[PDB]
Nucleic acid binder design. Sequence first.
RNA 1: UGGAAUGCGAGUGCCUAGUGGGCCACUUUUGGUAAGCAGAACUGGCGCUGCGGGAUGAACCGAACGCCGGGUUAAGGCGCC
RNA 2: CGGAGCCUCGGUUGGCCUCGGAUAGCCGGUCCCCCGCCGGGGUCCGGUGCGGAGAGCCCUUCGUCCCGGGAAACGGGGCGGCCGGAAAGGGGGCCGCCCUCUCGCCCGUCACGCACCGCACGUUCGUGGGGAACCUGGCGCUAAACCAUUCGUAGACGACC
Lengths: 190, 199, 109, 138, 176, 247
Amino acid sequence: MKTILSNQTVDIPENVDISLKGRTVIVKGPRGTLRRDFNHINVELSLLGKKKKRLRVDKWWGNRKELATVRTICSHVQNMIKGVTLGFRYKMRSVYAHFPINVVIQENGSLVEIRNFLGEKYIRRVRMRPGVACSVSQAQKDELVLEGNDIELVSNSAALIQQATTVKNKDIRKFLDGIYVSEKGTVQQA
Amino acid sequence: QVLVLDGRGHLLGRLAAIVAKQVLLGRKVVVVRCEGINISGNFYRNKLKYLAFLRKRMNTNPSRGPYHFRAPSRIFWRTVRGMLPHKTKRGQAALDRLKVFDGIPPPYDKKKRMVVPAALKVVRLKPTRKFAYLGRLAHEVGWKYQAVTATLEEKRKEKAKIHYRKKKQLMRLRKQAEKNVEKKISKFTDVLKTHGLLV
Amino acid sequence: SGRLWCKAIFAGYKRGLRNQREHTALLKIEGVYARDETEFYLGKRCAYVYKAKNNTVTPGGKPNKTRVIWGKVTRAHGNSGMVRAKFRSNLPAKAIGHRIRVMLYPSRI
Amino acid sequence: VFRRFVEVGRVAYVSFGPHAGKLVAIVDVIDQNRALVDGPCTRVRRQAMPFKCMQLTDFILKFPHSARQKYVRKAWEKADINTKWAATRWAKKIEARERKAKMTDFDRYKVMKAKKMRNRIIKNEVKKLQRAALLKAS
Amino acid sequence: MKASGTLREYKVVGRCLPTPKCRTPPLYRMRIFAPNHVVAKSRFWYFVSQLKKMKKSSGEIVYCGQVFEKSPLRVKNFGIWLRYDSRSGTHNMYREYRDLTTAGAVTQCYRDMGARHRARAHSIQIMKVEEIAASKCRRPAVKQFHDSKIKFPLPHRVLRRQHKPRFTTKRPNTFF
Amino acid sequence: SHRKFSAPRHGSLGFLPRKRSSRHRGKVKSFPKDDPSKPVHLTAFLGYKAGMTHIVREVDRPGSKVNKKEVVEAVTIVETPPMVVVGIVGYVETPRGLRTFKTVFAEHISDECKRRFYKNWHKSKKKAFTKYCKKWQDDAGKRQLDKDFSSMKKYCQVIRVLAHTQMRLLPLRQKKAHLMEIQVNGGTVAEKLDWARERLEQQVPVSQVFGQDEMIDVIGVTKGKGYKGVTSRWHTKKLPRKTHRGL
RNA sequence: UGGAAUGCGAGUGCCUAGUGGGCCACUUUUGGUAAGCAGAACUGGCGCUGCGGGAUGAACCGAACGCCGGGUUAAGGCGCC
RNA sequence: CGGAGCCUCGGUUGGCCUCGGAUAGCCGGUCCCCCGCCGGGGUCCGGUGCGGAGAGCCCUUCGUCCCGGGAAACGGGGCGGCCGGAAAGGGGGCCGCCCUCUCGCCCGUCACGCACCGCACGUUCGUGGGGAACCUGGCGCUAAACCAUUCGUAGACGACC
Ligand SMILES: [Mg+2]
Ligand SMILES: [Mg+2]
Ligand SMILES: [Mg+2]
Ligand SMILES: [Mg+2]
Ligand SMILES: [Mg+2]
Ligand SMILES: [Mg+2]
Ligand SMILES: [Mg+2]
Ligand SMILES: [Mg+2]
Ligand SMILES: [Mg+2]
Ligand SMILES: [Mg+2]
Ligand SMILES: [Mg+2]
Ligand SMILES: [Mg+2]
Ligand SMILES: [Mg+2]
């Protein structure tokens, strides 16, 4: 049936000062600014309270499919606040059996050269979205580190190289090779 | 005496049914900016509908077959011609009275165009339902002039912004002149307020 | 020194799907699209004004090329302000979607 | 962000229907698209009425959801809606539309002979402001 | 029966004809939900022919009169016990309606059963309609209106009166 | 029923209007796309097929058996005299089509180019371009031409140049020179039109247009063979000898 | 006191053409896997019949027909054709 | 480019000279404040079934003759230079002048105008489009195509080079 009211609040930390024009939200703070346009979701955004301490999202007279769309806005706003405060440092491992996967990074995090995967002479030049920085960390042999603010762009850049390092026309249950996401965390801790 | 109709946000068949009757009733209808026409339903069903329409061709000679036009203005002409008795002389006269444009030409850019609310997307559809742009559909199915129309419309939106800025300046001059002169024209002002024009 | 007739467009005849009764004409008067609003024009005189090749006589002036077919607005039609008319001579179907003059001087005011 | 809310006690303008063009109060909410509806002073009998015809306004007088017509009338007279409604620009442009509908032909001739000079004076003053702005710019 | 327009509620009593076996048959009363009194008497004979050994020629209707709502202005919660015929078998229901009158609630019941289940009015058989307090309600669509300080906007005012301003300049506003 | 032994089809449907060509000179259907990084240059030329001979050259390709060998290959000689530029034309971009905006000819236009505008040069009085060439030695005509070029600076997107072949140096029987539009692809529209005005009434050789070891496109009309049968044209399988009504 | 209700003018004699290939439909039902198959019972249509509707249409729904004017419906519909 | 009659073809019976765009959101300003080549951002202030409303805007024609009041004095109208327009291009704006007014519009006196005696196609865009010929004057103009012949890059004949 049409549920008369569904709502969920987001308590924002004092380091962040959010605002909104219409239904598009912006989140700024220490690391940078992140925007998201909500023109597909059709809800009410109340930015109430002095010092803008909480964001409320209403849905009036919507059945189950639009009631499912209420918590996802809360989740995207909380992910954006987490990206602005802390960030998204996706650590990921290069698993191989025989051939060492040669990974190097061109243009300070914009492109990844992937070489020597199952003895293939073809190289993969996988380009990240601007905003995501790829790097090789210290004290670890096979490691790729993806830094960024937008969880969409960082995890999409992870999925690009994870689907680039795939084994074709073989048994992937035996050939356990490729670069795979290992740790999903933040840049700085809290 | 010419219905200059906008095409942005208007539904395809709901607009065409309103257009074709007024064209049969002796009114010169010019529907303009027809790439802004949006069709209800998601994009993939409308694309596969037009692709089945493209596959439906004459086997022995497709030049004799159904002429599948790719421009959005000619798709609107196709659906109005489907909603007309075009085999008859009054239907051919209706097709002569109809005049449909891609983009908006300089004969019709400096004219206040009309909007039909009985065929509009925000009026006739629920906001959670999907719609498909006819211009994007046409450029994806093989219409070559989306970016050209985009640049020309960007130029004329800049020109119309300058014109509307001049109109706002004239409206400010009118209101400030009324604010200055209201004392000596209060005799003309009060007689329209007793008849219900400025209240 | 102005217009003394209301604008009305002749749509078609009294017709079914596969039959037409061409003695009764369907008239679409501009500005009126309701049965409560079409009660004013009931009983007015209307005419299709057209001009031809040969000259015909004109009452109160020199002979001109213009010709008419006079009539009488009988009763309303439909729900959207369409109305009927019975003429003495039937209208040609050349006049489909053209202007005729409905008048005001058969008045009930 | 919404400002008007269907609340118990809100006064609303009825657009169409039998009681068209009248103020009324929301006594109780019956269904999704039907409300329990009463107007004591504006001559609208206690009835059920959908939300399509009523246009909810910015007036809320306080009475309980099951309160009867005597208490609705006392809250109406305490809130004094009939004066502020006529003071509002809403009902003023409504009665302006009513005067334009009831405009007589001789009244329309007076309107035309007023508008003619009232527009000529505006045109002269706008031309003087245009040449003055041109003189200040140059 | 055709559920034409709105329904009406009839208190229909009837009995058997006097016989040399029994001189005075007992009287049987029902609450018939029907548009008019002719189909009320017909549906009364239908239910009496279902329940007892009694037909129209072997009996009579003593009085058939419409009985009204004792509080039509109060909004109430009617729990209607349904016995309808599906396309596969026959089923029972217990369904709540928030409405003013019994006849209007049964009208809404016929409309909503034909809405959700395509149950025709000849298949739908009503056995009992009872007014119920707000505490004993079961359905959440009825219980969501149980609030003293109820408050909601009208979110998307899709405008009607569309074909009088057919050819207009301005786009219609729909935020009210 | 179906075809027993499936076979590929004789002919191509991409070329199916097999009519005599309305044009005799090979028309460019698509010019190369411009970019402002490249300087201004011609993108086409109009030569004449002279003949055929051998060639002997070294092959430099790694991996082949034919590496560092002396092969022979068939070559075409195309005599390409330098063409005379006698006009320009600008093109506005419309949503209906790439429309020619304004064509501006030159002052001194040779009789080779004058032959093309006439079907019968003998009976003609040779009076073309006479009222057009008076615009180049007066005050008002130069102002109108400068206004035309200044409008072409603003509104034209594609600038094509008008060049005709030099027929007097050729050993052909005809004297009627072929004219051709060549799209100048290069920098901005202003620099393009300035370079075209500089190259107006000038010779254009082939070293300016093309160069060594460049892969080019050849447009032209096929050698005509007349009304031919389906065996000669579509190369179908001949019916056997025993057929009554033809094989 | 024309011995129930309702309705209708009845009875009777010659001469007599054409026909004697039928088909379809709610219900019952034989043979057959089934058939726009073959064969039956009641009744109505087509044949012999136009008209409005089912886009189209020998059988379906409505309704049967002299020539016209005003009105009103049935069956069907009322975004455009 | 600058006059009269006379045939045919028809519809027509005042124009709207333009923001973009959202619909769980819009419109208009001052800008105390800050950036850019007047625009943009925040804040502030009034509306928001829209009244900086197409449920709307502009013009309004019966006419002329005298006088008085409101309105105008910086305006109506009468020939040259300079700019803006190309997607299928606007009878637009600015400077003047050798000449004419307190007539144009709004209120009141004052009469006149075939008052054609109740009777219908009346009233414009209309110097409307097309074809014939007469008029008066000025400034400009001195052509191609096809057949024939020839060629053979072509071809049944036509066509084509
Ligand atoms: Mg294998
Ligand atoms: Mg006329
Ligand atoms: Mg095969
Ligand atoms: Mg043989
Ligand atoms: Mg026989
Ligand atoms: Mg037999
Ligand atoms: Mg049978
Ligand atoms: Mg019969
Ligand atoms: Mg029949
Ligand atoms: Mg059918
Ligand atoms: Mg039947
Ligand atoms: Mg009849
Ligand atoms: Mg129909």
